[PDB]
Symmetry: C2
Subunit: 149 residues, 2 copies
Amino acid sequence: PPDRPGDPAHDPGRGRRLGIDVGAARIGVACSDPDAILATPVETVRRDRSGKHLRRLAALAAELEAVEVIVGLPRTLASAQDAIELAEALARRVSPTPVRLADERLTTVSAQRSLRQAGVASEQRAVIDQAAAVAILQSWLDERLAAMA
Amino acid sequence: PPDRPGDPAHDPGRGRRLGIDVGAARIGVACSDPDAILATPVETVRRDRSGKHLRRLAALAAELEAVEVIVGLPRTLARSAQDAIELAEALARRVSPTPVRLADERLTTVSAQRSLRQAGVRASEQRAVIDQAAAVAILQSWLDERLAAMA
């Protein structure tokens, strides 16, 4: 189940958010401004079997003083499973900072990723993963402010 | 009519693109990396009757060495096409020879997203920077479409 943006039971209030798109080999990362309005692309983290990506993702949360971390949740058919496993591993690592699952279905991110795949050079493939992170994070921020109003 | 991303007849090859979302009071600005892959927010420019905003947009195009400037084109009914067209034409005279192109907003959900943000704005802090989100979305659409057209 995706989490609900701006849920009062979970919302930590104002501050920078981190947003994460979990790819097969690379993880796109975005962050918000301190007032949690606007997503900006940050970096593409290399996914490695030994989990060094979890160390970098937790370092980024610390570096940006993130109050909330958002991970894209793809639809179960399609994997959700990989996103959930990263979200859970990261949640343990960055506690007490909360990690929330953003429903990808509220965006066109899955279509967009599929368009870039067919269009996208290796360096470019890397950096373009941040565009998904921005889109998922922006959705969360937009939905959150809407829910709060 | 919107321009066609990656049109081999007009494409200038490699370089940073500036992206622009034309609001009634505020203009959001975004820009790409030099390889025209990824849109990042730049700033919000206050619109004003005296045309100062046109000067600031040209300033950004020069500073970021834009090889192309992309303006969001909304539908003719509705933000209105005519507003965006007018700004695009005025901007084109100032950034020449840099070409100014019109990106079809209908290939994105930018119109819905802006409505949602407007509805949710309850603070000046939000209203400042929020227009950059539409600029990023429209510009990223241009970049995605361009890459796919060229592939």
